[PDB]
Amino acid sequence: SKSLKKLVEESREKNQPEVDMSDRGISNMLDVNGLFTLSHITQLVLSHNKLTMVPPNIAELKNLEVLNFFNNQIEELPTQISSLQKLKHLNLGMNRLNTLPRGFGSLPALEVLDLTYNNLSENSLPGNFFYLTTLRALYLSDNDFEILPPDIGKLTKLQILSLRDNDLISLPKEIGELTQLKELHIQGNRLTVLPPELGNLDLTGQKQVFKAENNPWVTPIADQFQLGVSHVFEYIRSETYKYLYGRHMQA
Amino acid sequence: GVPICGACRRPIEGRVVNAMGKQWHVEHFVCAKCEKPFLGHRHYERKGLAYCETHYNQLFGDVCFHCNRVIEGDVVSALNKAWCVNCFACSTCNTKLTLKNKFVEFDMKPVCKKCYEKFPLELKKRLKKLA
Ligand SMILES: [Zn+2]
Ligand SMILES: [Zn+2]
Ligand SMILES: [Zn+2]
Ligand SMILES: [Zn+2]
């Protein structure tokens, strides 16, 4: 119930690390009064507002480890967003991002990035995006990705990768290189063929996940899906399969 | 007097291996999954029990999906992932949750019921035919 002045001023004297301003109809963070003096907060929630942009002032909030802009209307981020040296959790889902800013992968600490439900594609990603090697959870579901960059293989600490409901015509073979991968959601795309190198992953355990429904798979994979998870990885490690892949890529 | 072992519940006549308030026999101060004892090796307590090194991890070694340090104390298990009781929360408004709250699996993240209500109808319609 408190107004935007009491939540700014009480988090400075009572010394609260965690500000919540979720669902407060803010259109603009410079209107939140003295918000950017709060240079010792570690968590800033602004989901469910009406933000159209994040201002360069985000950079003074030096010690943010959690920054949640979920379900706003942001068309653009400031390059300063990558200077948050303590930042680990960044949530940008349900926004209107079709681009990311210069040097976004410069985040030295980031561990969970969530870009779900935007207008992102491969061209939206800046060049240094995969210097984000601290990342272990990357959610890109509901976007317009037609190809995933080969450099996905450099996110070696990745345990979770969601590409649900994108436009992917193919998986990059480098996904085999993500040893620590636990969850892989690729439901909803235009995949017809898994890359054989993906068999290097064992996602058949119970604390692991591999969803892939609603994809125009080729009939021999479709039928290993009916049989269960492990029967697809077996069949893609297959050598009968390998002769399929190469004669498919050229067809 | 003579102290009384904590396992066989007989009194001890030889070496009295004091540990965890109770007194023990040399061969009965053991690990709680594999049977064998320590014999002077070091113990790892947990709520009255004790384990060796290479088993103490396999149980009490779940790691908090939020803060990534290994969970000491109560272990919230949900959605094929694990949380510290104070780390578990809504993934979209970061207010704290318990397994007794109503929440929704969204790409295996927890979403509080109030937050799910604000999702685009396009999206909610499609997720009810997924998993
Ligand atoms: Zn005994
Ligand atoms: Zn043991
Ligand atoms: Zn934790
Ligand atoms: Zn919520």
Residue numbers in the entry:
A (entry chain A): 2 to 252
B (entry chain B): 189 to 319
Excerpt from the paper describing this PDB structure:
Ras suppressor-1 (Rsu-1) is a leucine-rich repeat (LRR)-containing protein that is crucial for regulating cell adhesion and is involved in such physiological and pathological processes as focal adhesion assembly and tumor metastasis. Rsu-1 does not have catalytic activity but its primary sequence analysis indicates a leucine-rich repeat (LRR)-containing protein that implicates for protein-binding functions.
Our structural results reveal that Rsu-1 folds into a rigid arc-shaped architecture with eight consecutive LRRs shielded by two terminal capping modules, and it engages via its extensive conserved concave surface the LIM5 domain of PINCH-1 in a pattern analogous to some LRR–protein ligand complex formation that is referred to as “hand-clasp”. The superposition of the structure of Rsu-1 bound form with that of its unbound form showed an RMSD of 0.56-Å for the 249 Cα atom pairs, indicating that Rsu-1 retains its rigid architecture, and does not undergo major structural change upon the binding to PINCH-1. The conformation in the C-terminal region of Rsu-1, which is disordered in the unbound form, essentially remains the same structural arrangement as the unbound form, suggesting that the C-terminal region is not involved in the direct binding to PINCH-1. The analysis of electrostatic surface potential of the Rsu-1-LIM complex reveals that each protein surface displays distinct complementary charge distributions and binding architecture at the interface. In addition to the hydrogen bonds and salt bridges, a hydrophobic residue of Phe71 of Rsu-1 that contacts to Phe307 and Thr280 in the PINCH-1 LIM5 domain also significantly contributes to the binding interaction.
